[PDB]
Amino acid sequence: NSVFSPDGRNFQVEYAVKAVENGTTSIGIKCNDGVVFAVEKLITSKLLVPQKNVKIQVVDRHIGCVYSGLIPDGRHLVNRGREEAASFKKLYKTPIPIPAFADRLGQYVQAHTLYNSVRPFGVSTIFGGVDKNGAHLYMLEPSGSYWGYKGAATGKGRQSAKAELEKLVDHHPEGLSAREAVKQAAKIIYLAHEDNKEKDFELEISWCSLSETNGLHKFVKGDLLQEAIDFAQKEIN
Amino acid sequence: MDIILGIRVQDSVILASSKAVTRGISVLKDSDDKTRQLSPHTLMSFAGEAGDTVQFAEYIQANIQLYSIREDYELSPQAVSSFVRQELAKSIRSRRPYQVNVLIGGYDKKKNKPELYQIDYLGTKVELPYGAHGYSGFYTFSLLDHHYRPDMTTEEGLDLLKLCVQELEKRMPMDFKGVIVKIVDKDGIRQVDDFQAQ
Amino acid sequence: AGYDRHITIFSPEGRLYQVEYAFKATNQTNINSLAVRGKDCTVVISQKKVPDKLLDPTTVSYIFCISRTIGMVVNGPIPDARNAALRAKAEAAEFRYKYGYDMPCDVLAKRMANLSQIYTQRAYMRPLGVILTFVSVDEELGPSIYKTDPAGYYVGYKATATGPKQQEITTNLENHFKKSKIDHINEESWEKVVEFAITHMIDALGTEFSKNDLEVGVATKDKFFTLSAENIEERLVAIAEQD
Amino acid sequence: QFNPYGDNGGTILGIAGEDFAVLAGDTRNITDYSINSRYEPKVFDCGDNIVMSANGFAADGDALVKRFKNSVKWYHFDHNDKKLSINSAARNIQHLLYGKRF
Amino acid sequence: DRGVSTFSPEGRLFQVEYSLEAIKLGSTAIGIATKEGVVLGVEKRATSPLLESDSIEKIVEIDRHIGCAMSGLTADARSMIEHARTAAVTHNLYYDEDINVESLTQSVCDLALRFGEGASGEERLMSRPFGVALLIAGHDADDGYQLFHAEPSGTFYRYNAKAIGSGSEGAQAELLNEWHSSLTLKEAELLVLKILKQVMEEKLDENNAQLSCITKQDGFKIYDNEKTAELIKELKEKEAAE
Amino acid sequence: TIFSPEGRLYQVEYALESISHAGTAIGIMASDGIVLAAERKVTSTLLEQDTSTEKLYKLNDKIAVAVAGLTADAEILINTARIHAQNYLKTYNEDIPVEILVRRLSDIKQGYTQHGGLRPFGVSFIYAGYDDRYGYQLYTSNPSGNYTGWKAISVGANTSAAQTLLQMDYKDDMKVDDAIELALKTLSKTTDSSALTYDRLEFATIRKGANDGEVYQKIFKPQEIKDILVKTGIT
Amino acid sequence: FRNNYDGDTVTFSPTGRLFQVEYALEAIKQGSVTVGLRSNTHAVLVALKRNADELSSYQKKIIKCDEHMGLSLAGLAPDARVLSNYLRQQCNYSSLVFNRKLAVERAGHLLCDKAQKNTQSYGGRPYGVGLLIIGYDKSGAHLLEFQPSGNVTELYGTAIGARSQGAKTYLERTLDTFIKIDGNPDELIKAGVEAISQSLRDESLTVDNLSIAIVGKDTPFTIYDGEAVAKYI
Amino acid sequence: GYDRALSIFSPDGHIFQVEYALEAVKRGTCAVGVKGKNCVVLGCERRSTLKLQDTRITPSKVSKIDSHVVLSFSGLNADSRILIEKARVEAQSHRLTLEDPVTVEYLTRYVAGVQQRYTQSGGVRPFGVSTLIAGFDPRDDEPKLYQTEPSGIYSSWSAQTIGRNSKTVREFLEKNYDRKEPPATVEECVKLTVRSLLEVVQTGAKNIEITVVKPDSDIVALSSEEINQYVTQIEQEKQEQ
Amino acid sequence: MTDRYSFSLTTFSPSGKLGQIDYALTAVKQGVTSLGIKATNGVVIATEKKSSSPLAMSETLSKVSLLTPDIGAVYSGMGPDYRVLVDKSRKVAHTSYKRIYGEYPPTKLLVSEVAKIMQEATQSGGVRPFGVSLLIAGHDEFNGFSLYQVDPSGSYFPWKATAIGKGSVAAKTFLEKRWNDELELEDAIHIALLTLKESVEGEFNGDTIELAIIGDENPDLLGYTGIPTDKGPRFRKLTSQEINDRLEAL
Secondary structure, eight states: OOOOOTTSOOHHHHHHHHHHHTSOOEEEEEETTEEEEEEEEEEOSTTBOTTOSOOOEEETTTEEEEEEEOHHHHHHHHHHHHHHHHHHHHHHSSOOOHHHHHHHHHHHHHHTTSBTTBOOOSEEEEEEEEETTEEEEEEEOTTSOEEEBSEEEESTTHHHHHHHHHHHHHHOTTOOOHHHHHHHHHHHHHTTGGGGTTSEEEEEEEEEEHHHHTTOOEEOOHHHHHHHHHHHHHTTO | OOOEEEEEOSSOEEEEEEOOEEETTEEEESOOOOEEEEETTEEEEEEESTTHHHHHHHHHHHHHHHHHHHHTSOOOHHHHHHHHHHHHHHHTTSSSOOOEEEEEEEEETTTTEEEEEEEOTTOOEEEOSEEEESTTHHHHHHHHHHHOOTTOOHHHHHHHHHHHHHHHHHHOSSOOOOEEEEEEETTEEEEOOOOTTO | OOHHHHSSOOBTTTBOHHHHHHHHHTTTTOOOEEEEEBSSEEEEEEEOOOOOTTBOGGGOOSEEEOSSSOEEEEESOHHHHHHHHHHHHHHHHHHHHHHSSOOOHHHHHHHHHHHHHHHHHBTTBOOOSOEEEEEEEETTTEEEEEEEOTTSOEEEESEEEESTTHHHHHHHHHHHHHHHOSSSBOOSSHHHHHHHHHHHHHHHHTOOOOTTSEEEEEEETTEEEEOOHHHHHHHHHHHHTTO | OOOOOOOOOOOEEEEEOSSOEEEEEOOOEEETTEEEESOOOOEEEOSTTOEEEOOSSHHHHHHHHHHHHHHHHHHHHHTTTOOOOHHHHHHHHHHHHHTTOO | OOOSSOBOTTSOBHHHHHHHHHHHTSOOEEEEEOSSOEEEEEEOOOSSTTBOGGGOOOEEEEETTEEEEEEESGGGHHHHHHHHHHHHHHHHHHHSSOOOHHHHHHHHHHHHHOOSSSOTTOOOOOSSOOSEEEEEEEEETTTEEEEEEEOTTSOEEEBSEEEESTTHHHHHHHHHHHOOTTOOHHHHHHHHHHHHHHHOOOOOOTTTEEEEEEETTTEEEEOOHHHHHHHHTTHHHHTTOO | OOBOTTSOBHHHHHHHHHHTTSOOEEEEEOSSEEEEEEEOSSOOSSBOOSSOOSSEEEOSSSEEEEEEEOHHHHHHHHHHHHHHHHHHHHHHSSOOOHHHHHHHHHHHHHHHHHBSSOOOOOEEEEEEEEETTTEEEEEEEOTTSOEEEBSEEEESTTHHHHHHHHHHHOOTTOOHHHHHHHHHHHHHHOOOSSSOOGGGEEEEEEEOTTTTSSOEEEEOOHHHHHHHHHHTTOO | OOSTTSSOTTOOOTTSOOHHHHHHHHHHHTSOOEEEEEOSSEEEEEEEOOOSSTTBOOOOOEEEOSSSEEEEEEEOHHHHHHHHHHHHHHHHHHHHHHSOOOOHHHHHHHHHHHHHHTTTBTTOOOOOEEEEEEEEETTEEEEEEEETTTEEEEBSEEEESTTHHHHHHHHHHHHHHHTTOTTOHHHHHHHHHHHHHTTOSOOOOOTTTEEEEEEETTEEEEEEEGGGGGGGO | OOOOOOSOBOTTSOBHHHHHHHHHHHHSOOEEEEEOSSOEEEEEOOOOSOOOBOTTTSOOSOEEEETTEEEEEEEOHHHHHHHHHHHHHHHHHHHHHHSSOOOHHHHHHHHHHHHHHTTSSTTBOOOSEEEEEEEOOTTOOSOEEEEEOTTOOEEEBSEEEESTTHHHHHHHHHHHOOSOOOOOSHHHHHHHHHHHHHHHHOOOOTTOEEEEEETTTEEEEOOHHHHHHHHHHHHTTSOOO | OOOOOOSBSOOBOTTSOBHHHHHHHHHHHHSOOEEEEEOSSOEEEEEEOOOSSTTEEGGGSOSSEEEETTEEEEEEEOHHHHHHHHHHHHHHHIIIIIHHHSSOOOHHHHHHHHHHHHHHTTTSBTBOOOOEEEEEEEEETTTEEEEEEEOTTSOEEEBSEEEESTTHHHHHHHHHTTOOTTOOHHHHHHHHHHHHHHOOOSOOSTTTEEEEEEOSOOGGGSSOOSOTTOOOOSEEEOOHHHHHHHHHTO
C-alpha cells in the first residue's frame, strides 16, 4: 500500500478499484438548485424487508452520501464525515461547505494509501448538497481523488449509467430541475440494472434542493417515489 | 520527641536507642528496638515519623543485603552512608518525603576504624565522634564535649553513655523507658542486653 | 519480491526504487507546467485537460493558493497534490503565528523538501508522487521560483518546467535566456509575462490552446492569484495579433 | 467556591418481620427552606426482591440506585441469571460506596 | 507462515489448531461427574525414575469448591490457575458467596482470548495461545456438580465425563460405554483408575497416577498415595473376580 | 535475536564474524600493571595521528578499554559506561569496581540479544582496570554479553595467531615493561602490513605510578610509541 | 493469485477480494444451524445446539442482550461473546444516558461498524461468527442477519450455519403464513422449529438439542431450554 | 513497541524457539546436583577453547541467590545472569514482605515463571538456560533440589544433571543413586558427584568444581586440591579386575 | 498512522557485513567529489556545484554549510540527507553544548554528535542509514584547526587532507603528493583548486565551485562592535569573484 509499483501506480489502490467496479451501481445528478442521489439494492431473497435496508446516508443536515463497493467501508467513511462536519460547525458555527467537506473526505481517504499497515477503502462515494453558494456534486475514488461533477456513476453499471448522464448533460445546457432529475435518476438506475439483472432490485432515491427541501437532505418516498418508478418503467417497456 | 545516640570510641561504635513507643496519651511498647542490621559490620538507628521510620529502615536493609549477595562482599560504612544520604536527599523533594533521622555505625574492616555517621531526613550528612537526633542532643553534645576522649576503650564508651542516659532521665519531659545499647566492632554487632537495671 | 523494491531501503547500487517510482508517478496526469519571472511578478502556466464531459471543469485544478503571497503548482496525481497543499497551507500559517512575518517562498520549499526527505528515509511512509513548484514575489529576494521533488531535493530557478515534455520546454527557455542575456522577462506588466509564458509553451509543445486548455497563476507583491477563463482568453487574443 | 453537595432532606425507615420487610420513605424533596416536590419517590424496587433507598443528597442517591440496578442487571448477565441474595447485594453496595471513599 | 491470528481457507485459526496438537502430546487427564461428587485423575509421567513424583502437580485447587486438572504444556497453566484463583477469591470479596463453576470457567476462557501481536482487540498482552487444556470440576448450589473442558480457543464445554491428553481417543470411547447417571463416587473413582490403567504408556501405581475429587460436603481433596494404592489393590480384585 | 535449529544466535555469530576483520587489540596483565595495545586498520599518510583516537578509550581514572569492531557502536557503549561509573561514584563516594562496570556493559549487550529486534553492537572490548578489591584486572566482552577475565588476551583480527604467541611467552611474574615488549612482539607477527610503524599503533598502560602508592593511566603519545619501538629493536 | 494475497486483512487480492474475510465467513458455514423469523407481534430464534460428545453439552447458542433484544450465533463462539458483550454495553448506554431502549437497527449499524474495523487493521483478524439478532422496540418486531464482513441486513426470516439453505428455502415459501402469526407465540415458534428441520440430515431433534428464544409486544426476551421446549418436538 | 511474536506453534504442536533453547542447553557445559541425607552438592565442568585465563575474577558457575539457596545452570552465560539478578531481587523482596526467607520451592517457582513468561511475549526470545536450584528451607533440615528449563517447567530431583553429555551422567546416576540409601554424609555425596562428572570431563583439574550446601546457610566451595583428593582416590581405587 | 517497522533495517549478513551501510557507501561513491585540506593557519573545504540545467540557480544551493561560527561542513552523496543532517547538527551544537557551557562545541565534539545521529540511523527500527559522507572543518582554542570525515556508519576520523565521492581515489593521491605540514592557507586553497580541476567536466569557474575556509577571525562579519573579546567567525565562504581571481594565477 505505501508501495508504488514500477509504473508509478499503487497496486493496492488499483485492486480496491476492482472491489468498487464489482459493487452495486449508484449515481448522483446535479440539478439547477440541488443534487439527487439514487442507488440499486439487490433483492437477494424474498425475505429482505422492503424499504428497510437503507443505503443512502445523511451527513449533518444538508449532505447526502451514497457509495458502491464494500458497504462497511462506506459506512466507516460516513462516520468520519460526520465527525468532520461536527468539528467544523463547533468551531466555525456555519454548516460545512461541500467543497470543504469534500477535501476532508479526500484527505482521510488519501491517508489510507500512505502506509503499508493500512489498506485503502473499497468504495467510490458519491455525495453532495446545497451550501451558501449553490449545489455541489462530488465523486471520490479509493485513491482519495475527487472532483466536482455534473453527473456521476460508479459500480457494475457505471459505463451505461455514465452514457445516459452524458446524454442529459448535452441535451440540457440550461440545467435540469430537481423534480426532473429525480425521475431521470430512476430511469438511469433501471437502464444500469441491465448489467446486473440476474437478481431483482429495489430503487432508493434521495435529494437536496433549495426550493424543494429548503436545502436539507431528504429521502424521496410515497407518491413522488412511485411516480419515478412509473416514469422509469414506462421508458423501458 | 525518641532518643537516638551514637558514640564512637577507639575500636568500636556504640548506639543507644530508646525503648518507648508512644501514641497520644499511651505508651504502647516499652521494648522497641529502633535499629536494623544493614550488614555484619554496619548498624542503623532511626527516629522520626510513625510509619516512615521502619519502612525506610527495612527498605535500606533489603538494598544493602541485595548488594551483599550480588557482589559477595560487604560495603564500607562510608559507602553505605552515602547510599542512605542520597536516598534521603531524593526523598526530600518528592511528593511525600520520608521523615526519618538516622545514625549509621559501622566497623570498616579494610581500614580497621570504627565510624559514625549522622544523617537527617533532609539528607544532611556528617561524620562525628558522637551524635544524636532530636531533643536529646541539646543535653548530650555538651556533656560529651566535656567527658569524651578520642582513645577510649569500649568499656569507657559504655560509661560515657551511662552518663548521657542518666542526664536524659533527669531533664527530659518524657519517659523514654530506657535504652537498648549495641556495639559494632571488628567482630560485628552485639547487644549489651542488660543496661537498664545495670 | 525484493524488499529494496517495496520500501525505501538502499539497493546494492545505492538506490531507492520507491523514490524513482515516485518520480514516475509525477507524470501520470500528462500535464506540463512552466514558471517564469518578470521584473516584479512570477507566472506559472499549466495545461488543463478535462476529458470527461461529466466533470465540472471549474473544480479541476493543479494550482494552489498557499498563502496571500505564495502559489504552488503540482505535477502529480491530485490526492498526493492535495495532501501536499494542505500541509503547506498549515505550515505557512504556523510560521506566521510563531515568527511574526510571512513565510518566504524558499523557506516553505525547504520545509516541504525536508518533509519529503523523511519519507525517503523512513520505511512506513511512501514518498508522495509529486513535484511542487512554489512561486511568489518575495519581500527580500524578489520574484522567486523554488521547486521540490520526491527525493527531498529543491532548488531556486530563473525559470523551470515540469511534466512529460519537460526537456523541450526547458531547452526552449534556456535558448531564450542565452539570447536575451538576462535572467527574467524584461516586462513591466504581468499580462505580458503571461503572454510570454503561453507563447513559449505553444512553441515547445507544438500545440495551440483555447481558453479551457490552460491554467494561469500570477504572483505579485503582497498577492498570488489565479486567472479566470476570460482573463486567459484576453491573453490568447493578444498573442494572436502578433505571432 | 463550588460546593459539589446539597441536602434534599427526606427520611427513610426499614423494618424486618419474620417473612417480610418494609422500606418506607417520605415523598418530599427540599432545598434549604423550599419544597422542590411533594411526591418524588426515593424508595425503589431493584429487581430480585430487593428494595433500596439512598437518602441525603438526592443526586448522589440517584446515581447509587442507578449503579446498583445496573449491578443487578450485569450480575444476571455474568452469572447465568442467578438471583442476587440480599447479603450479596449488601456486600456489592459496600464496594460501590467505598470506591468513592475519597 | 504469515501471522499469529490468521484464518485457514477452512476458517480455523492456525495457532489455535496447533496448540490443540501440543495438548495431544500431553499426559492424560480424566474427569467424571456424578451426584455424589466429581472425580479428577491424572497420569504423572515422570521423565525418569529420579523425578520425585509428588513434585508433579497436575491437579490444583482453585477454591474450596473448585479444582482443576491440566494437560499439555503445563507451565502455561500457572497464569491460568493464578487468574482463576484471583477471580474466585475476588468474587467472594465483592459478593459474599462462592463463584459459580461456569462463571469461573468463562473467566479462564476470557483470559485465553488475550493473544495477538498488539492485535486490534483494543489489548492483547500475549503472543501465542496457551498450550494446555483444563478440566475444571466443582459444585455450586444452583447447578450441582459440574465438569468443564476449557481449550486455548476460549471455548469451554460441559461434560458428564471427559478425557484429555495423549490417551484421550481411547479413554473417551471407554467413558462413553462406562458412564451412566447413577454412578456412585466410589464407582467413578475405580473407573478413572481403570481407564488410566488402559492408556498409560506404564503400569499404573500410586506414584505415577494421582486422584482427587470434590464433594459439596468436604470441598476439593487431592487423594494421598496410601488412599490411592488401596483403590488400585481393589480395582485389581474387582477385575480378577471378573 | 532468534535461535537457529542448533541453538545459536544468528545476529551474534555474524557480529563476532564482523569483529574478526577489525584491527587487533591485545591486553596483557603484569604484576605491577597492565598493557593495552591496538593496531589501526589499513591507514594512510594523510590520516591525522596527533589528535587521533579510535581504539583506546578512558572510562574513568582507573579503567580503560580497547575496542575491536564498529567504532560508532563503541562510542555509544563507552558513553553509557562513563555515565554508569559516575552514577556509582555519586551514589557511593567510591570509584566503581572493575567487575561491576564490566558486568553492566555486558548486560546491555545481552539485552540486544534477547529483545526488541534491534541489531547487536558490532563490538568487543578489552578492559584494563585497577580497584582495591582485586588489584589489576583484565576483561573481555563481546556482542553476546559474555565476559571473562584474562592474564593476557587479544580481540579482532588474527586472534588465533596472537593467542598462540602470548601463551608461548607470557609468565606470571612479569613486570609491565616485559609486557609492553611482549605486546609489540605479538603485534609484529600477527600485522597485515610490511612492518609495525608508530602511526599504526595505539598504546596505554595502567601502572602503580612510579612513587606515590597511587594508580596512573598513561595513553602514549605518537612520539612515545616511536621511542618504545626503538628499545625493543623494531626501530 | 490466491497466493500472497491472504496473508492478512490489510491486503486486497488482484480481483478486489479480501481473503481473510472470506475465510472468516467460512467458519460460519461450518457452524451448527440456527433459524430466525418474525411476525408483526413477535420474533423468534431457534438454535440447534451441537454437542462435542454424547457425554457433552449442547453448547449454548442464544445470548440475551437486553429485555427487548437478543441474538443467536454460528461460528467462533468466543467471537459471539465479544460482540454480544459490546451489544449489552451499547443497549445499556442507551438506557442510562437517554432512558431509551436501543433500536434494533442501531444495534445492527453498531455491530457492522465494529466488524468493519477488524477488516482494515493490521495484526487483527475479522470476526469469525454470524449472528441472528431479534428485538422488539418502538417500531415493532425485527430480525437482522450479521456477517463478519460487517454486512447486516433486515429480514422477515433466515438461517445461518450448516445446511442453512434448506431452512432458508422453506422460509421463502412459507413467508405469507408465518408473517401473519400475530398474537400467537406458539404458532410462530412451531413455524420456526419446523423450519429448522429442513436442514437436518443429522436427525428427530431432541430435548437437549433444542434452544428457543422469543421477544414480543408484552414479552421480555426469554430463552427456553430442555423441559420447556419438549412440547415443540 | 516491537511486539512481533517470535515463539509460535508449529503444525505438529511444538514451539521451535523453546526447542532450540534446549539445544543451547545441551551445547552448554555440564552441571550436576545430587542430594544426600543432610546435604546437597553441585558440580560443574569448565571448557577448553582457551587456557590463558585469570580465574580469581572470572564468574564461577554456582551462584548464591540468598544465604541458604544456590543456583547453577547450563546454557547461555549471558542469559543466566539476568535470571540470577531477578532471583536475588525476589529473594530480598520476599524477606521484606513475608519476614521469612524463600523456601527453595518458591524461589524455583519464581525462576520457572520468569522463563515461561519469556516463551509467550512479543519480541523476546526464550532463555537459553536450564537451571538447578539447591538449598534448605529456613528452620528445615530436609534437603532440596529442583530443575527448571527454558519452557518454564520445574520439578524436584533426588539427583539430576543438565548440559552436554548429561544423557551419559543421568545414565550413571540412575544406576548408582539409591532412593533407600540417600548418600548418608557430605564426603561420600561429593564422591558420587565427582564420579559422575568424570565420564565427560577427562582430567579433575581446572574444570571440575564443587559446592556443598548444608542446613542453616552453610555453603562452602571446594579447592583445587580437595577436588584432586577425590579424583586421585577414585581413579586408582576403582579400576580393579 | 503509526510506525510498523520497529526492527533494524540494517542487520549483519553471514559474512558479517552490514549491507545497508555498504550500499550507503556506494551511494557516496556516485556523489560529486568533495575535499578538505588542513593548512597551518587554516582549513579549506571545497566541492563542485554540479548544476541541473542552467535554468537552476546554483548559489541558492548550499553545498558548504556553516555549522557554528568556527565550524563548516561539506559532503558527498545524497544532498537531501546532508541538508537535514546540517539542520540537526546546528541545533545539537546548541542543545548539547552552548545552552550548557555558553560557548560553541569544539570540532571533535560536534563531529562526535553528528556521528551519533548517523549511527542511530544504522540501528533504530524503520530507518535506512544516511547516504552521505561529510567533511567537517573547524577551529577551537584548545585544539586549533582540525578536519574530520564522517561516514554512514557513524565512524569519524581526522585527516590532514582528503577527498570523498567520484574522483576520490585519484584526488587522495594528488593530495598525498602535495601535502607538507608547513602549508600557508593561500597554498592549501591553490592546492584544493588544482585537485578539483581533475574531478570536473564542464566550466571550471567561481560559479561552479563552492569553497569555504576556516581561518582568522573576521571582525567585519560580526555584525556589532564594542566587545573586543571577539573578533568574529572563523568560517568564511569564498565569493564567486574571489575564486576566479585565484584561477587566473592558477
